[PDB]
């Protein structure tokens, strides 16, 4: 579409420049254009897609939380402005989540056969449904939570069959699914269980790793322990 006239390689190059320039909306737009070329993404390219959209939606989520807090405190009459503006940011956030979900559905997941790509995309699907769940309040909210859960569960089932317990994507998937359980599904015990099991199984596999792999895995393990420290 919009990036239709730019070469795939040039979109990827510009996405890397946009990251360096901290221009994450541009980065996301370039990576969307790259996906829409129709070819599968390499490991590095998947990471660029993910980083771009995590930064865009992360800023939107942070803004939404600031506005939602002000709106909660309001409820002297301030008028409709706080609600209206929270609604505007919410709608934008939903739109970005729907865009990422649409890239996953058209057609990244269905063409992803290797475990690493498929798990990566299914983790993304769980995450963007989780961000939709954070702002959901209407008839479809349970369905949004269930969609997040289903994506994360399929990713977990593949990861446990096909990846070692220290693989960083398997680890980050478990971490984010544990956050889902704690923050979204009102299942703190499931969150704690999953984080502990994940940590312990990773610990027991560190002996197999190179120095560099060890560093990658232990960094994520420390995020699991940080959540366990907060939760227990």
């Amino acid at each position: 579409g919009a990036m239709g006239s730019m070469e795939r390689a040039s979109l990827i190059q510009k996405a890397k420049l946009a990251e360096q320039a901290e221009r994450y909306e541009d980065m996301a737009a370039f990576m969307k254009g790259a996906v829409e070329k129709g070819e599968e993404l390499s490991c590095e390219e998947r990471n660029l897609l993910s980083v771009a959209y995590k930064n865009v939606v992360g800023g939107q989520r942070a803004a939404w939380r600031v506005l939602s807090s002000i709106e909660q405190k309001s409820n002297e009459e301030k008028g409709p402005e706080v609600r209206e503006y929270r609604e505007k940011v919410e709608t934008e956030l939903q739109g970005v989540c729907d865009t990422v979900l649409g890239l996953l559905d058209s057609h990244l997941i269905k063409e992803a056969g290797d475990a690493e790509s498929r798990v990566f995309y299914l983790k993304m699907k769980g995450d963007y449904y989780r961000y939709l769940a954070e702002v959901a309040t209407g008839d479809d909210k349970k369905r949004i939570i269930d969609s997040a859960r289903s994506a994360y569960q399929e990713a977990m089932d593949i990861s446990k069959k096909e990846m070692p317990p220290t693989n960083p994507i398997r680890l980050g998937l478990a971490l984010n699914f544990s956050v889902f359980h704690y923050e979204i599904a009102n299942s703190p015990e499931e969150a704690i269980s999953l984080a502990k099991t994940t940590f312990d199984e990773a610990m027991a596999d560190l002996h197999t790793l190179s120095e560099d792999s060890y560093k990658d895995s232990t960094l994520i393990m420390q995020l699991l322990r940080d959540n366990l420290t907060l939760w227990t």
């Binding site: 890397k16 990251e19 590095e44 990471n47 660029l48 993910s50 980083v51 995590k54 930064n55 992360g58 995450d127 980050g172 971490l175 984010n176 956050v179 704690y182 923050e183 994520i220 995020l223 940080d226 959540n227 907060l230 939760w231």
Partner: peptide, 9 residues
């Protein structure tokens, strides 16, 4: 608590 930041390539 914390999800993975995921904000740096």
């Amino acid at each position: 608590a914390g999800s993975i930041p995921g904000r740096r390539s």
